[PDB]
Amino acid sequence: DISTLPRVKVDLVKPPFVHAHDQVAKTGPRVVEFTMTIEEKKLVIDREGTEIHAMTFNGSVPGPLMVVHENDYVELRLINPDTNTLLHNIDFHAATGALGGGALTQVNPGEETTLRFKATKPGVFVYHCAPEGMVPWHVTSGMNGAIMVLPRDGLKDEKGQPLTYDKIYYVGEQDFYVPKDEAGNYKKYETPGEAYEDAVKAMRTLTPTHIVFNGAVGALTGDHALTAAVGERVLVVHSQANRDTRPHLIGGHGDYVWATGKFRNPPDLDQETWLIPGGTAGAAFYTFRQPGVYAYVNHNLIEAFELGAAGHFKVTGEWNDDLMTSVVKPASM
Amino acid sequence: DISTLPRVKVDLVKPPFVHAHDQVAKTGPRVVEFTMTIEEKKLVIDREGTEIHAMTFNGSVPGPLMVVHENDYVELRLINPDTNTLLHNIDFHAATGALGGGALTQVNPGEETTLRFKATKPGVFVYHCAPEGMVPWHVTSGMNGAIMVLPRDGLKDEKGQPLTYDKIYYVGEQDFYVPKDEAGNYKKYETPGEAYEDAVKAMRTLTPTHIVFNGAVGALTGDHALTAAVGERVLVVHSQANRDTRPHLIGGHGDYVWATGKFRNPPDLDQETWLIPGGTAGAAFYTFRQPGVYAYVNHNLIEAFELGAAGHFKVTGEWNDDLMTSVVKPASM
Amino acid sequence: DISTLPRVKVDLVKPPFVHAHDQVAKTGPRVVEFTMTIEEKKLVIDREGTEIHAMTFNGSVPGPLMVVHENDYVELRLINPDTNTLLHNIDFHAATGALGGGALTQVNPGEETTLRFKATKPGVFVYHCAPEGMVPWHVTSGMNGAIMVLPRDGLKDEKGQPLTYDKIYYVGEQDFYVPKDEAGNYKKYETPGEAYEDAVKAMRTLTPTHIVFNGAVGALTGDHALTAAVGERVLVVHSQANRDTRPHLIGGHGDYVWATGKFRNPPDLDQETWLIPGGTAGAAFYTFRQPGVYAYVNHNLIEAFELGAAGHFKVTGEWNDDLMTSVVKPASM
Numbered sequence: 001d002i003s004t005l006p007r008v009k010v011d012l013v014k015p016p017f018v019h020a021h022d023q024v025a026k027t028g029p030r031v032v033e034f035t036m037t038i039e040e041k042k043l044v045i046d047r048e049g050t051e052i053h054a055m056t057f058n059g060s061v062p063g064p065l066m067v068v069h070e071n072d073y074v075e076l077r078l079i080n081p082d083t084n085t086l087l088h089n090i091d092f093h094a095a096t097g098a099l100g101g102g103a104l105t106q107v108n109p110g111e112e113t114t115l116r117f118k119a120t121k122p123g124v125f126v127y128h129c130a131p132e133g134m135v136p137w138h139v140t141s142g143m144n145g146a147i148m149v150l151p152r153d154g155l156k157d158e159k160g161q162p163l164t165y166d167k168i169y170y171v172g173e174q175d176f177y178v179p180k181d182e183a184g185n186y187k188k189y190e191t192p193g194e195a196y197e198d199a200v201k202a203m204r205t206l207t208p209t210h211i212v213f214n215g216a217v218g219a220l221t222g223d224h225a226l227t228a229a230v231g232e233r234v235l236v237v238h239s240q241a242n243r244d245t246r247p248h249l250i251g252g253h254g255d256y257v258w259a260t261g262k263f264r265n266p267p268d269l270d271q272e273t274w275l276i277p278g279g280t281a282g283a284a285f286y287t288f289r290q291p292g293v294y295a296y297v298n299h300n301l302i303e304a305f306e307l308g309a310a311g312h313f314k315v316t317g318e319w320n321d322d323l324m325t326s327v328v329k330p331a332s333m
Numbered sequence: 334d335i336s337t338l339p340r341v342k343v344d345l346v347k348p349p350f351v352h353a354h355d356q357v358a359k360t361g362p363r364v365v366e367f368t369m370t371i372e373e374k375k376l377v378i379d380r381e382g383t384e385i386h387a388m389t390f391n392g393s394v395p396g397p398l399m400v401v402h403e404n405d406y407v408e409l410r411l412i413n414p415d416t417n418t419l420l421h422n423i424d425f426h427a428a429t430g431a432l433g434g435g436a437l438t439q440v441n442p443g444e445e446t447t448l449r450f451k452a453t454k455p456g457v458f459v460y461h462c463a464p465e466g467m468v469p470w471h472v473t474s475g476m477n478g479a480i481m482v483l484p485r486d487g488l489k490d491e492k493g494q495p496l497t498y499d500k501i502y503y504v505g506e507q508d509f510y511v512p513k514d515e516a517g518n519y520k521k522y523e524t525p526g527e528a529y530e531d532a533v534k535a536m537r538t539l540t541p542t543h544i545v546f547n548g549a550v551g552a553l554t555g556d557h558a559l560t561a562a563v564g565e566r567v568l569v570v571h572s573q574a575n576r577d578t579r580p581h582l583i584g585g586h587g588d589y590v591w592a593t594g595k596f597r598n599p600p601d602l603d604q605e606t607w608l609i610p611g612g613t614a615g616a617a618f619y620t621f622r623q624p625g626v627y628a629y630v631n632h633n634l635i636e637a638f639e640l641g642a643a644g645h646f647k648v649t650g651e652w653n654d655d656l657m658t659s660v661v662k663p664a665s666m
Numbered sequence: 667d668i669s670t671l672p673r674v675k676v677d678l679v680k681p682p683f684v685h686a687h688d689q690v691a692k693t694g695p696r697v698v699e700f701t702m703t704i705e706e707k708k709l710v711i712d713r714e715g716t717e718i719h720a721m722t723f724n725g726s727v728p729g730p731l732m733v734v735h736e737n738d739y740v741e742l743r744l745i746n747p748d749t750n751t752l753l754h755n756i757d758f759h760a761a762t763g764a765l766g767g768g769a770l771t772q773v774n775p776g777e778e779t780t781l782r783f784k785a786t787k788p789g790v791f792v793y794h795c796a797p798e799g800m801v802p803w804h805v806t807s808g809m810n811g812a813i814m815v816l817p818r819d820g821l822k823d824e825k826g827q828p829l830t831y832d833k834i835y836y837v838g839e840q841d842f843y844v845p846k847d848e849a850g851n852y853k854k855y856e857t858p859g860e861a862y863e864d865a866v867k868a869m870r871t872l873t874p875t876h877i878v879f880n881g882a883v884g885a886l887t888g889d890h891a892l893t894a895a896v897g898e899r900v901l902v903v904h905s906q907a908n909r910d911t912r913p914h915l916i917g918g919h920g921d922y923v924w925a926t927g928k929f930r931n932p933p934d935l936d937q938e939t940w941l942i943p944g945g946t947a948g949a950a951f952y953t954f955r956q957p958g959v960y961a962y963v964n965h966n967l968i969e970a971f972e973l974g975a976a977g978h979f980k981v982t983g984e985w986n987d988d989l990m991t992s993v994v995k996p997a998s999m
């Protein structure tokens with residue numbers, strides 16, 4: 001009887017940070033209550049000032065990472081304020097039935113709904129908007145995020161021993177299809193419905209104009225670089241709701257990788273690069289061994305360094321010359 | 334001595350249905366006799382009336398699913414009637430030697446051939462036409478299907494216990510490269526050889542104009558939706574002879590997935606989405622838990638909902654409110 | 667103390683051949699000394715005479731395969747002669763820290779450097795040039811190769827028994843983005859810096875003009891086909907530094923495949939086709955069972971047969987009619 005279970009309210013935080021949670025469940029099954037408010041907003045996605053109408057869950061691209069344990073219930077209050085202009089809904093790939101919830105959560109501006117589902121399968125999963133006849137348009141406008149369903153006993157390695165992360169980050173990777181004039185210039189629009197009328201043609205090229213982490217070129221750099229210390233164990237959750245990606249930590253590895261995101265499977269070990277299919281979340285565990293700057297990319301390096309799918313870590317601590325050293329620094333002899 | 338083995342004739346059926354077979358082999362090794370007749374035909378592939386010259390095995394795109402057991406012999410009589418205009422052949426990815434059979438099966442219009450191979454490796458496998466110098470042209474004209482080579486003791490899970498499907502469907506996914514005029518309009522042609530003269534340029538864009546299940550937009554919808562009941566175990570075989578895909582059951586999962594199709598490997602569990610590389614067949618097992626409409630897509634949602642890679646299931650039975658429920662239906666308060 | 671370890675000098679050889687090595691380490695950990703000299707050169711990449719400025723490690727596309735054992739030290743002397751025009755560096759995906767070495771190895775024309783790293787993780791790994799702000803440009807100009815880090819006890823199967831190859835080949839697969847005039851004709855240039863000024867636009871299409879093995883259309887055919895004998899065990903290492911590929915041996919299989927290249931994981935069995943993500947090396951083991959010609963392709967067959975990602979094996983020995991036979995040769999009846 002679900003009414004006899006504990007209810008716990010969670011306040012979500014902005015990616016790439018993740019709300020506070022316990023890896024090992026410290027209670028029995030609960031009803032975990034989340035509220036997300038839909039926001040349509042203009043977003044500047046590149047250094048050039050290119051502007052799109054973003055369709056967001058909770059004001060961000062990606063939407064926030066939700067975290068529960070296996071056989072908890074997710075209870076989502078989804079709010080579509082009348083300041084928005086479109087009909088939206090939500091499909092959880094973690095959920096079973098009703099198109100992942102999409103059939104039950106269609107909210108017009110001025111409406112709200114509350115969906116409950118049982119998180120029966122452990123892993124990281126995409127969630128995304130999916131309105132009939134407008135699915136790729138909403139998704140590729142940024143209206144996607146992810147949910148992590150932890151095993152009740154936390155994460156385990158390929159031999160059944162614990163893997164405990166010290167830090168967790170959520171990297172949402174977004175393909176955008178910004179329409180262009182005949183010369184190749186990106187268009188801007190006053191409303192989402194104006195933007196929509198060039199969108200299907202732009203999408204049908206299957207060629208993104210931009211591919212970004214955390215909603216913009218350079219978003220996970222500078223004052224917003226990801227951080228760690230030598231010795232720290234970091235889980236990087238990575239989603240792509242519409243298009244394949246191939247994450248890579250430049251100067252590191254994925255020590256343990258669930259490339260298709262599902263924790264009942266043993267992780268792949270020692271990955272350089274892994275394929276997260278479009279429509280999937282994956283997760284990589286790494287223990288930092290060297291200080292300094294790292295880049296974290298989609299390893300189609302064009303997509304990374306030209307189209308925006310690149311962020312940075314800044315890592316503190318002790319350089320290990322056994323692991324790597326410059327024997328003779330660059331010089332002319 | 335192959336001449337001392339039983340011979341069994343199989344009459345093939347039209348995808349997405351699959352000929353009758355036993356999961357667990359009820360006889361010893363056999364010679365399993367199949368006949369396929371090549372048919373070049375005009376095919377309307379979209380709602381707009383776009384017409385291509387399809388190059389088919391047995392009149393369908395995809396060709397039919399053949400089913401045998403490990404260490405059976407496949408004996409295929411391949412017929413190229415003189416009503417056709419091109420030279421064709423067949424390459425089985427299940428087979429060993431002679432370019433999968435392609436080197437031994439070149440048939441002009443008016444010719445037939447009979448190939449035998451031993452199905453030494455269990456899994457689902459692509460088969461496709463592959464005439465020297467015209468390989469992608471034939472494949473991307475629809476001239477591909479798949480063969481399932483079951484283990485003699487049936488399918489097994491990640492721990493060695495039986496997996497028994499109640500229903501099986503074969504989803505062939507086809508990328509087409511329909512040539513366009515300068516404005517973007519799709520061309521039509523009177524013969525395959527006329528179509529060929531714009532084909533290499535269209536293909537070289539690496540950008541399909543259409544991506545369809547069972548040979549057309551909407552083919553696996555309406556009166557041709559796939560069906561199941563709550564509680565039924567369904568195996569969905571999925572092939573793509575030329576281009577990567579990423580299948581996803583909207584509102585379900587792949588409970589057990591062989592994403593690259595080979596049953597000696599333990600399946601991946603609880604997948605949301607999986608990558609079937611171009612040139613591969615994969616297979617997903619799911620037990621339905623909720624009634625209603627599902628969509629089954631390539632989860633590049635542009636490819637799905639704009640280019641045609643989407644079908645439906647209609648599932649009968651009992652809604653499970655523990656698994657999912659609308660707590661507050663969409664409303665304005 | 668690294669100074670107390672043996673030093674062994676290796677002279678590299680031209681792909682697809684691989685320098686001599688021991689599968690099972692016959693010494694303790696060593697410092698393995700490699701020298702590579704950077705060469706910018708014009709390269710003809712197709713039958714039509716299309717010419718690019720290749721940026722090479724050691725004169726070849728791909729660069730040579732380096733081979734060491736787990737917990738050896740790689741010590742690379744990287745030489746950038748003043749006959750070159752650009753600044754280059756090297757990132758080892760096998761290495762830990764300093765952007766895989768890229769931060770420590772920036773060499774102007776006329777300079778050299780020596781990097782040492784510990785090969786702590788077994789597998790095949792990409793290495794590539796990666797100069798800040800010019801990364802995809804160098805990589806897609808051919809400036810990438812691979813390194814194999816063998817387990818000290820050699821390769822093992824999915825059950826822990828030895829896998830010993832008789833032959834090894836290295837297939838580097840290169841995506842090129844040759845700029846075109848308005849009609850679609852490929853441009854030529856007198857220097858790399860001239861070529862660079864059309865390069866970012868060509869790359870941003872995400873549509874290669876050419877996709878080749880061993881640096882040119884047809885490079886692994888004719889007098890340069892790969893060779894084997896029936897019964898021989900062959901390891902094919904395959905890398906793609908920038909873009910996904912899907913290798914396939916036409917008329918064979920990958921009996922044991924590490925599709926993402928890392929030997930601590932059990933191989934996938936009996937693969938028809940596998941996905942090597944861009945930014946990765948993979949490795950497939952096969953025992954030949956049939957003589958004759960094979961093709962080895964990227965199984966996007968357009969990429970293979972139109973854009974150049976196809977090579978051949980010529981295999982000697984005994985045809986096995988149990989495995990495959992023509993029962994009735996093509997004929998009209």
Ligand SMILES: O=N[O-]
Pocket residue numbers: 248249250251757758759765766796
């Ligand atoms: O090595 N990462 O580009």
Ligand SMILES: O=N[O-]
Pocket residue numbers: 091092093099100130581582583584
């Ligand atoms: O959740 N499937 O689009």
Ligand SMILES: O=N[O-]
Pocket residue numbers: 424425426432433463914915916917
């Ligand atoms: O069967 N290989 O194209």
Ligand SMILES: [Cu+2]
Pocket residue numbers: 055087088089129130131138143
């Ligand atoms: Cu929406």
Ligand SMILES: [Cu+2]
Pocket residue numbers: 091093128279581583632
């Ligand atoms: Cu989805």
Ligand SMILES: [Cu+2]
Pocket residue numbers: 388420421422462463464471476
């Ligand atoms: Cu054909």
Ligand SMILES: [Cu+2]
Pocket residue numbers: 424426461612914916965
């Ligand atoms: Cu093939």
Ligand SMILES: [Cu+2]
Pocket residue numbers: 721753754755795796797804809
């Ligand atoms: Cu370089």
Ligand SMILES: [Cu+2]
Pocket residue numbers: 248250299757759794945
């Ligand atoms: Cu890299």
